[PDB]
């Protein structure tokens, strides 16, 4: 594609913001964002404490230098620091001492499932040497108690508490175990961005300037003989190319083509609802947990026989975070609370949706290469890529590279490799 | 050209020797000479009498995992030996008030003081291999780390591998870098390690059983003299004749036993450096830290520590075996103190072992690789820690590399990570 083209990026989440940021180096870019900030799932909400204002990540928060080399380099290039926020996990079920945790060997669920936690690490480490985690567990003789009291809870930390996590791709889970992201024996190795995840997006927003249109949801995207027409904010805008950084769900709604292969490729993408509640109600902390960053509680009334229908809640104790250590205010995040959180203690709520990561869903992502470039249209974002923020931002980069702007970090071996892998995965 | 049914002696019955002999015996008439009363060397499990049974407590070698040690793991699996996760939780204590850090939680004044440095270090060790023939100390100096980090954090955590007498800050950087990137050592989590069920001695017990009368226990070799006919082994007041002789002893021992006019041997073997280690199996609970909660490894630096005299001062490392998951019902205290400064109450001491470890300075690695020049000459072969990558996998795989060269192929070719490790160690050894 020809230089100085008029390009629109639709959706200002991580993939869109990074796509736009790089595209603007060669093209006349405009970034449309439905909401009042750049970042989407990457949102840091200001909380007022006894130490000043903290920007508390409510969605996206975790990455590391190995898993997310491009995001890491981006942060580093921007002067943004990071810190280690280990994924310590405590799981509570109804009963007396019906728990296990990441940090120690205490709890009755640990006594009950000790052998299984052990074998699972071994097997996940031996695995990399296309099924679901559940199929694997069934097939390799793991107890139903392990599936629903250990596996499903630990996976909800990724997938949300409404997610059919046991149907998600095994390699996703195997890799997380072998890379020390999830573990039944130690707190996993993760980092957070200093000043919250929003910090890198703040800089992208500053760099893009008036090219960014906030609170401007795109209503329709209509390719024509002359170009592509974007209906947003009660006006009509004209472009040569349009980059989609929105979810497949949204993209289909916004897309206005006679072509019905679009309905085929974009319809049928499956999602999971997630509610993130930022609150100060300490009653959500476990009396046995407390110390653990991630605290999963399964409510009273759980039955193994009907486990498939029941769901818990996940609470994050932000006070455990090193930079929050002098803060005397409780800072808590409950994802998918079953009971209502005391609204006199609630700071803010966010409602989002995540993709399902079943092996069929992975096939569905890859197939999007068929419509890539057609009718002056491009696609990036989580639904075109590997899961996680690196996958998201790198998809944006893959599109920018295809549209003239090369991968910005070629001398960074792991960053370049990730770009190459994601470009291959996208079929671009 | 070496051929089948040769008379081969393996000198030294530690891990490398026992595995070398075990595989060699498939093709050759093998004899295994061992100085001590058991097969295993640094791999020693001592029986301890408790109210829930007699436990075989590893005093030396204890840790490995399925990724780091694929050949040993497969060997254990083939023998029907189970393993269990024994995470490397570490607690460090220095003389003041709450002058500690640990890798389970963010408590302690040393954590407060050095938290940011721990953090940067992880980042940098993870970024290192994707880019440096310095030592860990040179790195630390050069990348602006405080002296307090070098001696209150790095040196103590490194003693878990190296021993408390070790100049660990002189050891190769990539050794440390890899340990941090592979979650073996960490300032943020307990590292991923396994132990063998029934102790490490279990796999050796089986090798010993399989070898039978080919094993000569309590038979230290006095001299190894190559002749025009073959090689002569002087051991136990007798003279034994062999076609080939496989050395599985430390380089210093090898040079002492080795008897030739050739002085390239003196050049290649004479400059190997070691560190003494004393392992004390006891029941004196006064050695546990009052703050060092559930930590497996507990390092204590005695009163009188001075940062200026850090180079010459040394702590002690205590292992709390009662924290091990299979030892959870044991009411008896089971403890191992490495290099105790003060004497352990001898009315509470079960047994002591005295060993020596190699130094792993960048020069020492160069020295190991160099041993390819004498490999095969005068019917002589060399395996063991001083010819290989450090650790038990490196040790047992060196034994395998020699067995492969002498006709018996690597036993696990269809195990991709086991085969890869063999290939790497064979390349490193230059065999
Ligand atoms: C609660 C939660 C926690 C998470 N935690 C992590 C984590 O710790 N680590 C990690 O790696 N990943 C995490 N993720 C995954 C996350 O989805 C990805 O990391 C990444 O943020 C998704 O990138 P995206 O740009 O494709 O999606 P989004 O961030 O969802 O971006 C889509 C954007 O499109 C906008 N949009 C919608 N409609 C329109 C319209 N009509 N016109 C214009 N714009 C529109 C939206 O407002 C939004 O800004 C989390 C997700 C959730 C929901
Ligand atoms: C305290 C301690 C703890 C350790 N812990 C671990 C751990 O957890 N994990 C790990 O991977 N590694 C560990 N190691 C490292 C250890 O060096 C290797 O794992 C491995 O045991 C070395 O095996 P080797 O056969 O090369 O040497 P050694 O085990 O030292 O064996 C050499 C053998 O030669 C014999 N010998 C000596 N002189 C003569 C002679 N004249 N004639 C015949 N035989 C002789 C000795 O008795 C001995 O059995 C530890 C070492 C020590 C000292
Ligand atoms: C390295 C890289 O980018 O590639 C791998 C992806 C490994 C994942 C990205 C690791 C998971 C996320 O980064 C972490 C997501 C986050 C912590 C979940 C939601 N977070 C919260 O709720 C926080 C903890 O509060 C490849 C996998 O991606 C595919 O989507 C997946 C289904 C696979 O099959 C591949 C193995
Ligand atoms: C690939 C491989 O197998 O080896 C790598 C090094 C990683 C080590 C082998 C890990 C160290 C040991 O296996 C474990 C040491 C052990 C815990 C010793 C002491 N233990 C105790 O004293 C108590 C009982 O726990 C590569 C490095 O090996 C070399 O020896 C080293 C000097 C290097 O620089 C290489 C990079
Ligand atoms: Ca406080
Ligand atoms: Ca203080
Ligand atoms: Ca010292």
Residue numbers in the entry:
A (entry chain B): 4 to 132, 140 to 438
B (entry chain A): 3 to 133, 139 to 438
Q: Can I see the authors' text?
A:
The enzyme LkcE from the lankacidin polyketide biosynthetic pathway of the bacterium Streptomyces rochei represents an interesting test case for understanding such gain-of-function, as it exhibits a monoamine oxidase (MAO) protein fold yet also carries out a macrocyclization reaction.
In order to obtain complexes with LC-KA05, mutants E64A, E64Q, Y182F, R326L, and R326Q were soaked with the 1/7 substrate mixture followed by rapid acquisition of the X-ray diffraction data (owing both to the low availability of LC-KA05 and its high instability, it was not possible to carry out co-crystallization experiments). The structure of the LkcE E64Q/LC-KA05 complex was solved at 3.03 Å resolution and that of the LkcE R326Q/LC-KA05 complex at 2.50 Å resolution by molecular replacement, using the structure of the LkcE/EMAA/DATD complex as the search model, and the presence of LC-KA05 confirmed using a weighted Fo−Fc omit map. LC-KA05 lies at the interface between the substrate-binding domain and the cofactor-binding domain and adopts an extended conformation. The substrate sits in a deep pocket (∼ 20 Å from the protein surface and ~ 6−8 Å wide), and is surrounded by hydrophobic residues (L70, Y168, Y182, L185, M189, W200, L324, F345, V396, and G398). In addition to these hydrophobic interactions, binding is likely mediated by seven hydrogen bonds: two to the lactone ring at the entry point of the pocket (by N179 and T397), one to the acetate at C-7 by the side chain of Q428, and four to the lactoyl moiety (two with Y168, and one each with E64 and R326). Indeed, the fact that the R326Q mutant retains essentially wild-type activity means that we have not simply captured a non-productive complex with the enzyme. Taken together, these data are consistent with residues E64 and R326 playing critical roles in the catalytic mechanism (although R can be substituted by Q without a significant effect on activity), whereas Y182 is not essential.
